[PDB]
From a paper:
The retromer complex (RC) controls the cellular localization and homeostasis of hundreds of transmembrane proteins, being involved in their recycling from early and maturing endosomes either to the trans-Golgi network (TGN) or back to the plasma membrane. The RC depends on transient association of the cargo-selective heterotrimer, formed by vacuolar protein sorting (VPS) 35, VPS26 and VPS29, with a few sorting nexins (Snx) components (Snx1 or 2 assembled with Snx5 or 6 forming a heterodimer). VPS35 (92 kDa) is the central protein component of the cargo selective trimer and is characterized by an elongated solenoid-like alpha helical structure that acts as a scaffold for the binding of VPS26 - at its N-terminal portion - and VPS29 at the C-terminal end. Since VPS26 and VPS29 do not interact with each other, the strategies to identify molecular chaperones to stabilize the complex are focused on the stabilization of either the VPS35/VPS29 or VPS35/VPS26 interfaces.
In this work we present the results of two X-ray diffraction experiments on crystals of the VPS35/VPS29 complex in presence of 2a. VPS35sh/VPS29 was co-crystallized with compound 2a in different conditions. The VPS35sh construct was chosen since the complex obtained with the longer C-terminal portion of the VPS35 protein (M475-Leu796) produced crystals that diffracted only at low resolution (∼7 Å, not shown). For both crystals, the Fo-Fc difference Fourier maps showed traces of additional electron density, where it was possible to model two 2a molecules. The more stable portion of 2a is in close contact with residues Gln72, Leu101-Leu102 and Gln105 from VPS29, and Glu722 and Arg726 from VPS35. Site2 is mainly located in a small superficial cleft of VPS35 between the extremities of four contiguous alpha helices. Such binding site seems to be incompatible with the stabilization of the VPS35/VPS29 interface, being mostly located on VPS35 and involving only transiently VPS29. Finally, we describe a novel binding site located in a deep cleft between VPS29 and VPS35 that should be further explored to select novel molecular chaperones for the stabilization of the retromer complex.
Author numbering:
A (entry chain C): 475 to 779
B (entry chain A): 1 to 182
Write the structure that this text describes.
C-alpha cells in the first residue's frame, strides 16, 4: 500500500531494540530499571512513526522485570515498591503511544499490563489492574469504530478479564456489566449475538476475591446472556446466518450444562435443537450450507456420547 | 509429509530470535508445509519461514501487525483436515471444552491452537489437539516458566507422529506422540 508505511522501513529499529532487550536481561534488576528509563528517553526521540515499534518491547520488558522482583521477594524487601514504579513506567510509556494517535496497540498493551499486575500481587495491584482495564475500555469506546475491530477488541477484553482473579466484587461487577453493554451495542447483529454469548463466561468462570478464589458460578446470569443472544439471533433475517447463530448458542448452552450449571435444563436444549431441525432444511444448497449441517450433526453426535 | 507447527515468537515484543539450537535444527529442503499459530509480530519472521518451505500457512495473532493474515484456516494435508487458530478467540483461554466446541464447528481431525505459550497435545472425543507452545519461549503473564518449544508432524497414512522439541536447560529434548484417526 503506497499510502501506508512499509514495515521493512523499521526493521533495523526493531532488530536494535530486540538486541538491546536481550543484552539487558543479563543485568541486575535494579540496573535494568535504570536502563529502561534511559531507553525510554532515547527511543522517545524517534517520533510517532518509530515509537510504534521501539516502545512496546520496553513495556513488555517492564512486565517481565516486575515478575523478577517477585521471585526475589524474600531477598529484596522493597520489591513491591519497585513493582509500583514499574507499572507506572508502563502506563506512561503506553500513554505516549496514544499521544502518537494509536489505539489498537495501546489497548492490548494495557490489557497485558492488567494481567501482569493481577498475577504479581504487589501492594495496590488491584488498583493498578483496574486502572489498566479502564484505560483499555476508554480506547475501545473512543477510538475503535470499524465493526470488525470492535468485535476483535471486545473478545480480547472479555477473554483477558475472564482469567483475572484479583478484583473484589465491588470492582468485578462494573467490569462485567461494562463488557455486557459494549457487546450488546456492536453495530452488526451477528457480532452482537456472538459477543453477548461470549460474555456468559464472565458470570461463570470469572473469579473475584470475595469467594476465597472460587468461580462466580452465576448460572442464572449466564442464562440471561444466552437469552439475550438468542433474541438478537431472531432479529437476523439472513436465514443461513440465523441458523448458524442458533447452533453456536446451543454449543454454548451445552458448555455450561456439562460444567454443571443447574439453570441449563434439557428443555432449553430441546427447544433450541427443535427450532434448528425446522429451520435448517430451508437453506440454499452450497459449500457453506453443508458446513452448517455438519456443525449441527457434530453437536448432536456429542450430545449422545 | 512433514509439517512444521510453531508460533508465539513475539519478535521483538518479548524476544529477539529463536534459540540457537532451534535455528540449527530448522533446515531448508526437508519441510513441506508450515502451520503457524501467529504472533511473530514482524514480516522479518515470515520471510524466515518462507526459506524453510514454500507452503506457509499463518493465522492472525492478537499482536500481529499484518491485518491480512486470516483469523482461522483449514488446511488439508494428506488424509488429515487440520484446523488452525491462534487461540485468543477461544474463551476461556486454553480450555478444552471451549476448544472442542470449535472443533465441532470447523469439523477438523486435528485442531492446532496457541496463545497459552504451553506445549500441549491430547486426544478428546476421537479428535486430536496440538498446541506447539512458543518457539522462543516468550514471556506470558499467566505462566512464569516458559519452555521454548515447537512441533513437527510426520505423516502419510491416517496416522500422526508428532515430534515435540523443547529447550530444557541448554539442550533439546524430543518426545514422540502417535495418534491415529478412528
Amino acid at each position: 500500500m503506497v499510502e501506508d508505511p512499509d514495515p521493512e522501513d523499521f526493521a533495523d529499529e526493531q532488530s536494535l531494540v530486540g538486541r538491546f532487550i536481550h543484552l539487558l536481561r543479563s543485568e541486575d534488576p535494579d540496573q535494568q530499571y535504570l536502563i529502561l528509563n534511559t531507553a525510554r528517553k532515547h527511543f522517545g526521540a524517534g517520533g510517532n512513526q518509530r515509537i510504534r515499534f521501539t516502545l512496546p518491547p520496553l513495556v513488555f520488558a517492564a512486565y517481565q522485570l516486575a515478575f523478577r522482583y517477585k521471585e526475589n521477594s524474600k531477598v529484596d524487601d522493597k520489591w513491591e515498591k519497585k513493582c509500583q514504579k514499574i507499572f507506572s513506567f508502563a502506563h506512561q510509556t503506553i500513554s505516549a503511544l496514544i499521544k502518537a494517535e494509536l489505539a489498537e496497540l495501546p489497548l492490548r498493551l494495557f490489557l497485558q499490563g492488567a494481567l501482569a499486575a493481577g498475577e504479581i500481587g504487589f501492594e495496590n495491584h488491584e488498583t493498578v489492574a483496574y486502572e489498566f482495564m479502564s484505560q483499555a475500555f476508554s480506547l475501545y469506546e473512543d477510538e475503535i469504530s470499524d465493526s470488525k475491530a470492535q468485535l476483535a477488541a471486545i473478545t480480547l477484553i472479555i477473554g483477558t478479564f475472564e482469567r483475572m482473579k484479583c478484583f473484589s466484587e465491588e470492582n468485578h461487577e462494573p467490569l462485567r456489566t461494562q463488557c455486557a453493554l459494549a457487546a450488546s451495542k456492536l453495530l452488526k447483529k451477528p457480532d452482537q449475538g456472538r459477543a453477548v454469548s461470549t460474555c456468559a463466561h464472565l458470570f461463570w468462570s470469572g473469579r473475584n476475591t470475595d469467594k476465597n478464589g472460587e468461580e462466580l458460578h452465576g448460572g442464572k446470569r449466564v442464562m440471561e446472556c444466552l437469552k439475550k443472544a438468542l433474541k438478537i439471533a431472531n432479529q437476523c433475517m439472513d436465514p443461513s446466518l440465523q441458523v448458524q447463530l442458533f447452533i453456536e448458542i446451543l454449543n454454548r448452552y451445552i458448555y455450561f450444562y456439562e460444567k454443571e450449571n443447574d439453570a441449563v435444563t434439557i428443555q432449553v436444549l430441546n427447544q433450541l435443537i427443535q427450532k434448528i431441525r425446522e429451520d435448517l432444511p430451508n437453506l440454499e444448497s452450497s459449500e457453506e450450507t453443508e458446513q452448517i449441517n455438519k456443525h449441527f450433526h457434530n453437536t448432536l453426535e456429542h450430545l449422545r456420547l | 509429509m512433514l509439517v512444521l507447527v510453531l508460533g508465539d515468537l513475539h519478535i521483538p515484543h518479548r524476544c529477539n530470535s529463536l534459540p540457537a539450537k532451534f535455528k540449527k535444527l530448522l533446515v531448508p529442503g526437508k519441510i513441506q508445509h508450515i502451520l503457524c499459530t501467529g504472533n511473530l509480530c514482524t514480516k522479518e519472521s515470515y520471510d524466515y519461514l518462507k526459506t524453510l518451505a514454500g507452503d506457509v500457512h499463518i493465522v492472525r495473532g492478537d499482536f500481529d501487525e499484518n491485518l491480512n493474515y486470516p483469523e482461522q484456516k483449514v488446511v488439508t494435508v494428506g488424509q488429515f483436515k487440520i484446523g488452525l487458530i491462534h487461540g485468543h478467540q477461544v474463551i476461556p483461554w486454553g480450555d478444552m471444552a471451549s476448544l472442542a466446541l470449535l472443533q465441532r464447528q470447523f469439523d477438523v481431525d486435528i485442531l492446532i491452537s496457541g496463545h497459552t505459550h504451553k506445549f500441549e497435545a491430547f486426544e478428546h472425543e476421537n479428535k486430536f489437539y496440538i498446541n506447539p507452545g512458543s518457539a522462543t519461549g516468550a514471556y506470558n503473564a499467566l505462566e512464569t516458566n516458559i519452555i521454548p518449544s515447537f512441533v513437527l508432524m510426520d505423516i502419510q497414512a491416517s496416522t500422526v507422529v508428532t515430534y515435540v522439541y523443547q529447550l530444557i536447560g541448554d539442550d533439546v529434548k524430543v518426545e514422540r506422540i502417535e495418534y491415529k484417526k478412528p
